Amino acid sequence: VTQTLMNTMQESSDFLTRINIVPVSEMKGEKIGIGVTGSIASTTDTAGGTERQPKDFSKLASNKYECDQINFDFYIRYKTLDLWARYQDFQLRIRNAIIKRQSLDFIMAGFNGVKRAETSDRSSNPMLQDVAVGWLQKYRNEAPARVMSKVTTTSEVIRVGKGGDYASLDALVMDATNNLIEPWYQEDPDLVVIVGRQLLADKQKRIGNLPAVRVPYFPADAMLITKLENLSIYYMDDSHRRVIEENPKLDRVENYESMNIDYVVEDYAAGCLVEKIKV
Amino acid sequence: VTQTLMNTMQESSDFLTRINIVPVSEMKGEKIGIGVTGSIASTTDTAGGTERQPKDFSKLASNKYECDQINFDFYIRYKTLDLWARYQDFQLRIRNAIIKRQSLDFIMAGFNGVKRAETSDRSSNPMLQDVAVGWLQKYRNEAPARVMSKVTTTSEVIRVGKGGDYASLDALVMDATNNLIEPWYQEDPDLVVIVGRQLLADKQKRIGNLPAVRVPYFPADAMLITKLENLSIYYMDDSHRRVIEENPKLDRVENYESMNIDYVVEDYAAGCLVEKIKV
Amino acid sequence: VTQTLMNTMQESSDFLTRINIVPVSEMKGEKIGIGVTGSIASTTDTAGGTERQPKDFSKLASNKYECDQINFDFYIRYKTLDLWARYQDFQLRIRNAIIKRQSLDFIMAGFNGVKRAETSDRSSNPMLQDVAVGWLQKYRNEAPARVMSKVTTTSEVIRVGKGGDYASLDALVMDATNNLIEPWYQEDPDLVVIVGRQLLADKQKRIGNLPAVRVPYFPADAMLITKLENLSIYYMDDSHRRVIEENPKLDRVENYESMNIDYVVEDYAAGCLVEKIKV
């Protein structure tokens, strides 16, 4: 029944609708392959000679993905609760607000998360980093290739200024696409560049030869290019557990809720990122 | 039943639809928190160690809002009334006109209101100022910070001319956003700039990195930046009282109507304003 | 029942839909004030002190409008009629044509009419001038002020050429707006400039402020600025009279029709016109 809530959350936010979310009933295994393209068409002599052998479309290679839990937990005083109850039919109003906050927090944790560690903190981490391992960290860790942090081997700051390595940013994206992406991945019909809020320069008209799209939260001075169906998140089906209760202590009612999730990029050779950009 | 009329008025005008209006049944208390965002997601060892404590989303800090009444009151002669009655089914026509006028007057009183005082006047105040305390005055009074009236400490005229402090206005909005707004408020997905009619320069295409929108009435040489859901108005539920009657004196029929309202900005750290702009 | 036909005629053409037309049952009196906006909100001590006095919204001042009749009259030969009677449902094919022509004639007579006089001529007046008094003539006659036609007192040819008084047109628009319109009328959600065809300069076409719009027929070298709901036409309800003849005269079936109308601007403070523009 958790799939109903998960699909509701996915529909609630636009960005998540462009991404896929699948429930896996086990804990640690191998991942489904969606963003794979190939030339499955062929022909061969089937009369007096060789025989035809098929070709997979799964591309399983070193995933060993494992899922961990995260929990959202909050509380409300009684005065605020009564003020909300004064609203006409606030039952839907509260639900929509909490759903929207959870959906936004998913992405905020996803894009710039790194180094999952117990006993998370919200003092030194305004943006939540140590809550789970993210897509960017997944690239930066599992495949140390296909990332441009250095230049070739001088200072590892890819600059675009006066003495810039790539004075024009479209030339940079062209070089990245032509160098660190597979040939039959070059001309894919739905490749998209993800960039933050500072590097926009006000123009989703076009960039290089690929459409652009921004996200709510994203590390500045960092860019990515991939299909908007490659990356995804997995959530264990029968692990969503919530409980609400009030306590006369400090006159509040609180709720706790926990799910088991893990971010995962399906294909590695489709999509590269760059970091440490100046200007 | 007043909520029906209030929602009708809100729907009648487009701008008010983008804003929220909630009925509070008490007079003076604490305010609901809507425009609040945070990283409620976390993780911590729940087996053999610490325990998890939730986190509020209310952010109550020094509101002490109090509501006052305002009343609209007018009259019509008999000749104009009969001429209106000559129209085919004018009953809806009159109602729509008065609703539109009330809705527009709400905003006109809201944006540039200051220093609520009894015995309002319409001679020295073409625009109504002393009718109620407005959002701009609320910022300028409750939080003396997050407002740029001076320069740093030379003349307090933020100029954009030849010897201008900010020759380019987009640089000004960038500086304001980066300086007087909270970090996790910087990249919010629905931040909007409010500007009057003179500072438009003909271009809602784009400004800086934020979309722009104008309002019917607004103080010239003044600009604001915030979410279009932060600010709001509160109206006491059981306080709307109206009465109509005719008097043979000077051959007229008049009506009086009074409501209890108060403008309120939900979050202060989300949204800053600037005043006294030259060119 | 004439109101049904009048409403059909109004709905037929687009420009007339943006304008208001009303049946008046009397002949000469005071006008209905639709397009006016005043701050009706206020507040005053009603306990131990003064009392609250309402505020009208009519602002009637020296209106004194008087209606006059105009009549249409035409005829068709039997040959053209028999040819028309060939289509499937020729009735609508004729009705829509005559309705559209009558509406176009209404607009033409409205915009550049002057000095109503009996025994109208169609030789010396290609465009119909002496048929009725138009909005432009109404401004030029009733309010001799609030019309910009001279320079200050040299030649009254407002030029925008090389040595022009206002080499840039939008500067002239801003000057006229800020010098001839009321303060609380300087900004309004629908203030629009009307201009002819030759003065368009190819750029509806977004202009600096007051988004422009053209009309079918309009005097060149003249411009107006007002709300598209300010001006209007009034028609006497029970005065529409038509009659048909099929005469054994030379060869024809003719028809005559007559209505009683009068053009009227609702408020003079909202809207100014400029004439005799060079270049």
Add this chain to the structure above:
Amino acid sequence: VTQTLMNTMQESSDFLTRINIVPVSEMKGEKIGIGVTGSIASTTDTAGGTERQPKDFSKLASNKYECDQINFDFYIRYKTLDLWARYQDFQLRIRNAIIKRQSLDFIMAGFNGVKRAETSDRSSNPMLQDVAVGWLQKYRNEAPARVMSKVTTTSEVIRVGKGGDYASLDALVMDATNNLIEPWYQEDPDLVVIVGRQLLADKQKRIGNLPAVRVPYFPADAMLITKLENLSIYYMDDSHRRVIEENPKLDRVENYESMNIDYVVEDYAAGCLVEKIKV
């Protein structure tokens, strides 16, 4: 019943939908007047004096239009017929194709047709010229005025090059409109310029002050300006005769079909053309 087929054909193509087609039951007579505009409104003393006389809207002047027949006739082999029959429900497919071809051929014959002559040929006339008299030839023949083939009286090549008479083409269209069109035809609300494919220069954005539209086939170095309701075609109602039959000779099935049509421009003073343009 032919009107059903004619309306089907008119709806099939977009361009013909913007034009009118009327069935006339006689052969040679006078033409219906649609694209006529005038000031039918007037006023005159009907009490003690003159009487009011109506005004026609037919404008009959020297039409004497006469209709001639044209016939389409083709054939298909049996192999192609069976291959078509292999398609799923090809009965509609064949009909749509032949309707589209007939509709396109109507226009192709219309725009650049001249000098109707029996025994048409398809060797020396790739584009069909001698099939019927066209709109362009109708202007060039019936009204020798309102056409600019010469300059005033030097070489009759209206050039736009270096030593061009009209270096700017919009100036040319402005001059043509102001010179060879009637005054009350100048500002008509639906005037349109027709131009071929070579003179487009890639920009229906705007040209001069009139919208532009291209047609499938059109003589290069030729331009026209008129209302898209002035010109039209007439077709005799009870003259459409078709017959299909197969003949074992050369293994084919053929069909012949004949209609009686004639192109006609309604008003001459509304719309002028220019020819022999260089660059």
Add this chain to the structure above:
Amino acid sequence: VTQTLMNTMQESSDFLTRINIVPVSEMKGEKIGIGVTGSIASTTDTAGGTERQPKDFSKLASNKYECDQINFDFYIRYKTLDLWARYQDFQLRIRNAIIKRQSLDFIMAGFNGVKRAETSDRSSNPMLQDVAVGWLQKYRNEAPARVMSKVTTTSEVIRVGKGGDYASLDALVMDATNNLIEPWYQEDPDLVVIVGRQLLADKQKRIGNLPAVRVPYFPADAMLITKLENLSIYYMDDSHRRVIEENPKLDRVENYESMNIDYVVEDYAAGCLVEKIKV
């Protein structure tokens, strides 16, 4: 019943919807003519003289098309199958994915296929070439004319650089259209240019005088111009044979499927291509 699946596949992808697919029940014969235009209208004396002879619209000239089979064949492990089955109603999900892959692979094989040969390979041919003969190869083989690989007779590299033959690409497309296309094919109302991904230069706004459209896979440094209804593919009706089965060997379930298809361009004189472009 195969037509249901074929139409489903055609609808699944947008590009194939703009193209036609017809089932032929024989193996090798003559092709249907769709993209043919002509002046079928004519006129001739049918009384006392010659007789009228119709004109074909088939244009059969040297097609001799022959169809060959291609087969798609793949397999899935059991773990991936169970993971897919965990999804809610994956039966449609798998079908949509395989349909999309087949549809894309059709085009990828079509545009840059050459020299059909048995025992296809996927090592030295990342893009599949020897699977079937494609449209480009069809032009380059059957009609050695209407292709610009050389210059006139210097180096056969049509360059656009500094010393370029055609410095401007629109001039190149204009020259190609005016030279290697038939006159009555020049002004066709739906001519379109096909270009790859590198030669886009970011601008489907417009190119030359024709609209542009890109395709997923296309040979770089190659361009084509034709109607989007000229080319097509033929598929034998009763030849689609598929079979699925599992084998405990290496724990997999596989499927094989074979169809009989052949690409074919309907008209040769409508549409030309150019290859070997520099810059």
